[PDB]
Amino acid sequence: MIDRYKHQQLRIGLVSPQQISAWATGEVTKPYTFHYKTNKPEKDGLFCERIFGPIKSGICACGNYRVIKFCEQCGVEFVDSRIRRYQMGYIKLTCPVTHVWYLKRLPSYIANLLDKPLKELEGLVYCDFSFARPITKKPTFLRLRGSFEYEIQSWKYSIPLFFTTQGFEIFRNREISTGAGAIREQLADLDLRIIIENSLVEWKQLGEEDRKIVRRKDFLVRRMELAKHFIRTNIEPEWMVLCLLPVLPPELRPDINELYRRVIYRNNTLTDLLVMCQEKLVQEAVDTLLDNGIRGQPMRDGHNKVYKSFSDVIEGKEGRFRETLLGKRVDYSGRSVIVVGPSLSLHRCGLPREIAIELFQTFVIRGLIRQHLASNIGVAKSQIREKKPIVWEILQEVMQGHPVLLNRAPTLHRLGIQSFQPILVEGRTICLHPLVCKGFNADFDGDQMAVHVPLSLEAQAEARLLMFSHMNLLSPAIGDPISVPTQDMLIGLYVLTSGTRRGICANRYNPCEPFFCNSYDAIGAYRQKRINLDSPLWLRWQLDQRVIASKEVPIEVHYESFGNYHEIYAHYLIVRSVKKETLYIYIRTTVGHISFYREIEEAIQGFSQAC
Amino acid sequence: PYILKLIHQVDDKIHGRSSGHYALVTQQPLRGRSKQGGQRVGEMEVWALEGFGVAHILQEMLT
């Protein structure tokens, strides 16, 4: 067989400022969210209707309307408000800011690719440190190496005075620079192949010669591994420092808006100046927006409460991955307290009228309309709300053959959710079969269950042919039966099959019972109070010897001179003869063993006859 | 004996839902009986559906 090939993929990659612009194209320039009076989206703000899309689909910021492209006065599109959930914006940062994930997280990717200690980069980005010789692909004329913490006295007055201002600034950012701009310049002019070769040769030199002699090696292996991945992909190492800041769509942030304001609050302040301190404030605003809590003390709000960043909202047990994506709340679902029903079949459950009418509402509407008892959908829904007596006939009709899924709360294995055929029961409780309680680990002291309705034909087929209880009698753990009688049923069976009192518990003195043609006679005598449940009796047996008993020789053989002999065992009597081939069997038993055997036999025979 | 009647009773626990209001961001059905919300199919319930192999029942409760 040729496999039905399906080649589907998804990939993440570090994004480019050009791709950010293509997302937004659309720049958010003002930190205003809404008008204080009219509660309208402020233009160029975090909720700008021109940037992100029309609130109240098909209307402009002015108030015009068109049938569901751009307006002239306010320039708002004519589309659905769906776009406000997907359209991105961007913030044009005056200075580049590094991405916190790629600088502060350990081990730092920027530090390893640039090959400098992390404290040096942190001082360069946060403190007032200037880096010497940031780029190499352009010539220089100075002998400043490393990152001098102190400002160079000559570079402050002498060289700027000799080299004036315009040309000096023209060649300024080629020998000395500071902040994330220097880091981005270093990343942009990196030669990755040279990095790989230098790392390999240094690794060989170290090897040809014992803790940090190894840790330096692991850095070299890590760096050339990191350098290789940039060559074969389309990612650029300078994208780890951000030039633009994408903005979340407004409808996803109806806390986050506060952090977006601060970026605009401090970036628009910085562009007014154009100073070192304000550049750092913009960088910290982006870090708090992107990832709080990595920089030691996390920035708090006025209430001394830690802000929540995108990393916080995507990670953790309550994050997007583990709470919104791996589990969902669903429609066509109900819940109620479960009570025991011993008269139910193993494949049936009982549903309250309210839960059933809610879950099967659309099917009841179809049933109403189909037989001309409802003119339209609205009339049918009004009839359903009025609890008309004909709503329940249609509900009972449409529930036939449509399975439902029950589920108890702590689903520890797959038998924690099973499929049953719903029937309408009075009250407000879910009627549950007693033999399926062990699979659900359910008892009737306050437990509740959820109900789900498969809608499509494929789901109904799956529920009927895979999840019903009569095809799930074995547990997948070891293969043992899961629907075994327990407690009350087990006690009843034990009492039924506990035979006669024997020995000194039957007779007061040392002994120095009715005979029934068939089991029906014995059971009839029991019904007429002629015998007890455990009183001994002899039953004529006309089948093969199939009674479980100890493998023992007869207690006593009564051999007659005419040829017939009687063999007396502990639990049966066998009459044989030498003249004939006759062989009679009488079983010493009670009405209880007969009843158990007849129950199982009649179950088998009735199931066979019904098919 | 002396038997008590407790607050935990039906008429305060029976809940049903066909469809209705959804969350503003996640667009999933609401949470809570008072809000006419739906029942949550968590990851442990998703594991059970994957144990049965019912891939179309699972997609209904996901999309």
Binding site: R4, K6, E458 | E50, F52, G53, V54, A55, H56
Partner: peptide
């Protein structure tokens, strides 16, 4: 599970008779 392995001549030409 169920998702495995991706789930006119002879006319207008009769005998004139």
């Amino acid at each position: 599970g169920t998702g495995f392995n991706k789930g006119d001549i002879l006319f207008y030409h009769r005998e004139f008779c």
